[PDB]
Swiss-Prot record, chain B:
Pfam families assigned: Ribosomal_L29
Cellular localization per UniProt: Cytoplasm
InterPro entries: Ribosomal_uL29, Ribosomal_uL29_CS, Ribosomal_uL29_euk, Ribosomal_uL29_sf
Gene3D superfamilies reported for this sequence: 1.10.287.310, 6.10.250.3450
Gene Ontology terms, MF aspect: mRNA binding; structural constituent of ribosome
PROSITE patterns membership: RIBOSOMAL_L29
Other remarks in the entry: There are 2 genes for uL29 in yeast.
PANTHER family according to UniProt: 60S RIBOSOMAL PROTEIN L35, LARGE RIBOSOMAL SUBUNIT PROTEIN UL29-RELATED
The protein, known as: Large ribosomal subunit protein uL29A
Biological processes annotated in GO: cytoplasmic translation; maturation of LSU-rRNA from tricistronic rRNA transcript (SSU-rRNA, 5.8S rRNA, LSU-rRNA)
Swiss-Prot record, chain C:
Lineage, opening ranks: Eukaryota, Fungi, Dikarya, Ascomycota, Saccharomycotina
GO biological process: one example: cytoplasmic translation
The name this protein goes by in its record: Large ribosomal subunit protein uL24A
Similarity-based family: Belongs to the universal ribosomal protein uL24 family.
Molecular function in Gene Ontology: RNA binding; structural constituent of ribosome
NCBIfam families: rplX_A_E (TIGR01080)
Taxonomic superkingdom: Eukaryota
UniProt miscellaneous comment: There are 2 genes for uL24 in yeast.
PANTHER family xrefs: 60S RIBOSOMAL PROTEIN L26 FAMILY MEMBER
Gene name of the encoded protein: RPL26A
GO cellular component: cytosol; cytosolic large ribosomal subunit
InterPro entries for this protein: KOW (IPR005824), Rib_uL2_dom2 (IPR014722), Ribosomal_uL24_CS (IPR005825), Ribosomal_uL24_euk/arc (IPR005756), Ribosomal_uL24_KOW (IPR041988), Translation_prot_SH3-like_sf (IPR008991)
UniProt-annotated location(s): Cytoplasm
Curated annotation (Swiss-Prot), chain E:
Entire-sequence positions represented here: 53 to 259 of 362
Protein name: Large ribosomal subunit protein uL4A
Entry keywords, A to Z: Acetylation, Cytoplasm, Methylation, Nucleus, Ribonucleoprotein, Ribosomal protein, RNA-binding
Effect recorded for R43E: Leads to a slower growth at higher temperatures but allows RPL4 assembly into the 60S subunit
Predominant place of localization: cytoplasm
Highest taxon of the lineage: Eukaryota
Post-translational modification comment from the UniProt entry: N-terminally acetylated by acetyltransferase NatA.
Family, similarity comment: Belongs to the universal ribosomal protein uL4 family.
UniProtKB/Swiss-Prot annotation, chain G:
Protein name (database record): Large ribosomal subunit protein eL37A
Any one cellular-component term (Gene Ontology): cytosol
Organism: Saccharomyces cerevisiae (strain ATCC 204508 / S288c)
Subunit-level organization: Component of the large ribosomal subunit (LSU). Mature yeast ribosomes consist of a small (40S) and a large (60S) subunit. The 40S small subunit contains 1 molecule of ribosomal RNA (18S rRNA) and 33 different proteins (encoded by 57 genes). The large 60S subunit contains 3 rRNA molecules (25S, 5.8S and 5S rRNA) and 46 different proteins (encoded by 81 genes).
UniProt superkingdom: Eukaryota
Amino acid sequence: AAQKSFRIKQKMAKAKKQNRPLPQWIRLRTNNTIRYNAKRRNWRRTKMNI
Amino acid sequence: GVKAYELRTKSKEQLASQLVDLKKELAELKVQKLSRPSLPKIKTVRKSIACVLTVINEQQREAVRQLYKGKKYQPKDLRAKKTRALRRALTKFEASQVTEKQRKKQIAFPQRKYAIKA
Amino acid sequence: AKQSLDVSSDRRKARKAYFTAPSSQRRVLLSAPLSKELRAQYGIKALPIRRDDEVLVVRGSKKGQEGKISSVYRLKFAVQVDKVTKEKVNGASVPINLHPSKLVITKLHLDKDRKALIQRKGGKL
Amino acid sequence: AISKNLPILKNHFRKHWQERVKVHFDQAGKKVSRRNARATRAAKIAPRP
Amino acid sequence: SEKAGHQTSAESWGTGRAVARIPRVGGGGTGRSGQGAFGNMCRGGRMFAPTKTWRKWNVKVNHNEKRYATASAIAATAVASLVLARGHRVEKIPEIPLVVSTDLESIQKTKEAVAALKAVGAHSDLLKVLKSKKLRAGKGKYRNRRWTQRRGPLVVYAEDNGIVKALRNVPGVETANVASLNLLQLAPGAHLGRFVIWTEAAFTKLD
Amino acid sequence: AMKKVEDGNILVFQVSMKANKYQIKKAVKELYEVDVLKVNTLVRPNGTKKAYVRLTADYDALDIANRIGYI
Amino acid sequence: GKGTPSFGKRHNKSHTLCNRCGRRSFHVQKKTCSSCGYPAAKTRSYNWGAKAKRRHTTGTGRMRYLKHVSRRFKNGFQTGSASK
Amino acid sequence: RRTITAADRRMVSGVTEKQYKKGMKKMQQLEKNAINTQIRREIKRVNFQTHYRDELLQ
RNA sequence: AUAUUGGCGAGAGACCGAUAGCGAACAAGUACAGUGAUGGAAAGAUGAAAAGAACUUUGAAAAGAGAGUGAAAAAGUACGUGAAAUUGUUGAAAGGGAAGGGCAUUUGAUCAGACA
RNA sequence: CGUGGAGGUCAGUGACGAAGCCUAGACCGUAAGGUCGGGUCGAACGGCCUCUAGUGCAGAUCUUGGUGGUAGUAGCAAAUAUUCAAAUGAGAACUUUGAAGACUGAAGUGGGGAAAGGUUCCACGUCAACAGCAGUUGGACGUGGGUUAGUCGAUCCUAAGAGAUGGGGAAGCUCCGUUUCAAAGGCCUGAUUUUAUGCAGGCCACCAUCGAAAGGGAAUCCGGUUAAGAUUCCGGAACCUGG
RNA sequence: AAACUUUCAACAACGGAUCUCUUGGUUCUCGCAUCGAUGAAGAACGCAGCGAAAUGCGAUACGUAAUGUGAAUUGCAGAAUUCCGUGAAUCAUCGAAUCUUUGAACGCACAUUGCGCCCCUUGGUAUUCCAGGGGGCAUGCCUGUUUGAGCGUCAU
Ligand SMILES: [Zn+2]
């Protein structure tokens, strides 16, 4: 909520910095098997239960 | 860059000054990283700071060692960190103790060595 | 055949140990033989490959071509050779990822810590 | 059941016997261990039997 | 593994529905929820009568049967019809119970041993071996059995001085003592016949 | 933030989360040789900290920002 | 209604984050994590939760200190400057 | 003064905007290719309610 | 002497070979579900080497067509081969409220051996 | 007869193309099945004597995966209602602006907030997927910016209650109990700093701790300002507490 | 007669079986014995020139030191004969250090980034107020020391 706690604002910040796609220069490395970011998250679909 | 075997020849205050004249550099490069896309010179400065602090600390620890030589109790940080069990276990002397009866028996009737033939 | 107990005849373990080898073991897997003149001069058969070594190719579509090394890509287990390249469709050029076993060293990037290696291996100047 | 002219046969597998099973694959792998131990001891006590 | 197929927590739902009574996973949010389990028919399930370690791998045989067979397999080596019929190239051999000198027990080099065996006429049976090296067929060649050769002659010493190490490397050739003789060398594949090269010391100790 | 430097005499910094508006005052006093009358801190949503320091008049922030090298 | 209407009123938690396992198990009215009873010194581990032990036992983390012990034993729990 | 953009960072670190557009569209394609499978392999065992009451007696 | 499905290091198998074998050959106790205890997946292979399709042209663009690389795009990142269910185009044939099948032969197609 | 593997053997087939797959094309066998040609494909595979088994499917309201007829069908119909012109654009029933008609009708379709959610806020670019039609738009895609407090809240107090200590139980995980059957503690001087307290020096027997963003409570207002912040920033005028 | 329906084949599609492969598993055997109050296992947060993860690490933050080898890393940029050298490296080894907030978890407490006390030091006019820095403050038990209580008790 608005009147929240720092223990939760921390965990929301982490989720904000995690919510991005994959860097395209990872796909150019040699023995690469990562196509996309399979751990993505958005508020519509999956709630992080904290 | 900066190098340990050059820094060991330097003293406390010189290294303390080198730290500051490196941290200023790092603070400048952290500005240039904004107005530029990439600054790899920054890594050498971070590792330089670390190589400096390492030397400072090691000097200071050796000092306290030389202070605590012979004194029976020296700090836990300086004491050897073997495993808890091997610090709790018996000393080589404490374990090789014997009763007077047993050492008399050992000096009188030791395990002779021998062989089977005429 | 093998007669010890601490060495493996296991395909799985061996291939793992190849494809997860570090860059310090790969230096020796990426070794190459010397030409029949340097075999006679330095007195050895093979050495690990190094940048700025001149070289000749003996097996491949680019046989007979000579060059000198520009990069040992010891993640691809490969090696790249000057005067040995391929023009991409863009007009640009990309070098060839050779493998050292299909090469022959003609001139050597001599140095201290290689003269020593040659000396311990029973070689000469 | 009891079906034919067969012996009465007593077989003690009503407990969880499958846990308390020991197959001795170790027979030769540890015969050699015993031999090595004898051989080592015998050199520790080099002239003694 | 004894715990295969049983790491799942599952129970049947029962009669009352349009699906079977096989045990089914419970929960949601993944594909496994509702899937069948614990059966031999089921993906992820166990197998039928999981293979256990307390099976009879090694088999007992009577000592006199073993010796009967070893003597028969020795006696077959003197029969050229069986040797030829078994895959040995001995058409250009003078005498079949082949007895070479006991100086073969003192040879220390493969370069010399092979020459001796070429002289007494085994050259063809060594070529047979090193021309028969074909690749295995199936899922046994990523199980450390990639290659298949044919068998070669069997040199039968009595007192080894280097021959067993000299012929250690040549393909196909095996090496044995007159004691400690092996049916798995004399009759391979249960096929009687084997080209054996005896030394005179061995031949004399066989009595 | 590069508006608040000219509009007010305000500098905006990124500071460690373990800093408490006194440490910041003294750090600015030490590094940039100025005087400070007011600090307002907030915690950004990326887990960093932001500090709006307001310098006394008799200290213009553009001079300090050019002296630092970011205008 | 016991379903769709009575699932609107689910807006106040009963579990929060534990400091010991980091997950939403810390009950608030009784103050006891349901995965590793936090005020209690012993972590919950029952032999019937044999899968649950896999998820929280050793190996599942970094092993900051422990993973150098086998290295330091192989060498004799030794000390001092290396060599030349 | 703004001598940096994310496009410029990724240009410095290899990828051009053409490469970025194409590789992005492929990473979007694959996400949908997978979501297809998750919606495909789920419709079977998703309506398998544990306690449906069947509002029909008389 | 003995025990040892755990831990560290090793060697091997008439074992499984990606619906199998540990649940996991892959960023797997991961994603995800559930208040929680707990539950718990799927997913391997281009090619020797990206040489991953320069350039032209129609289109708003995706794309298409040529061109090109390649030993091979009947390998184009939806990529080893690429079955079947199911489907489209072409061709042959039949067909009054089913179709399919057995015995026998006509007609059409096709194969034959040629005793050459 | 057939299948996966094992031991022997044909000095077996094979990149001049192994296996696999397709073939109303052929031959053999009563049959299980085997063999051949062609097409495709690209790296290992068979015959004979024996061994061994996780060895042969039309079914089990079988398991997993995939796919169909149904079928371009049922249907996308609650909440009074949309229309014109222009702009942008490849493209406008649905975007934007203007003009018109209307509705919610102050217990609102408004303005704000608690829980809860987590950056959904704002801007630029953008439309493969999503918005069960469409889409140039969007709570979507991508990249970034953004939350400023001595006075608002937490923090402080206690409530219903929870819960250590001393103790007592209990095989034990731990239970009771919260002042109990405890030796449960600190505050000011002459000593005038030897700050020790010799005396001084008296004063109950109180005796953890958590527990409310709606209870109790120390103190602030106006005006202005931003793409998105404000009783928080700027200007001005004030107040409280502790020194 | 076409359309339509059905059967076969070719080509193309849906789909991903079969064949071949396999840095994985499982089973057997051999050897070894090495967690923690000198603060473990586990957790949260954070760190890279461009990384969301996995792996690694801790404000000395994909790492510092030392030792060894002896010229790389490589997706891009950026450095570079420093390369006959105290010396590259997502190297190996590893004996020196650092080791955020935690956690048996240790000042009290914790749905709080809450509230304290002691010592040294610095600043503000400052034994008393405020702030900063460093170092400390758990419990049970043992040995010993120090100060004590008790007509329990001895002598003078
Ligand atoms: Zn917990």
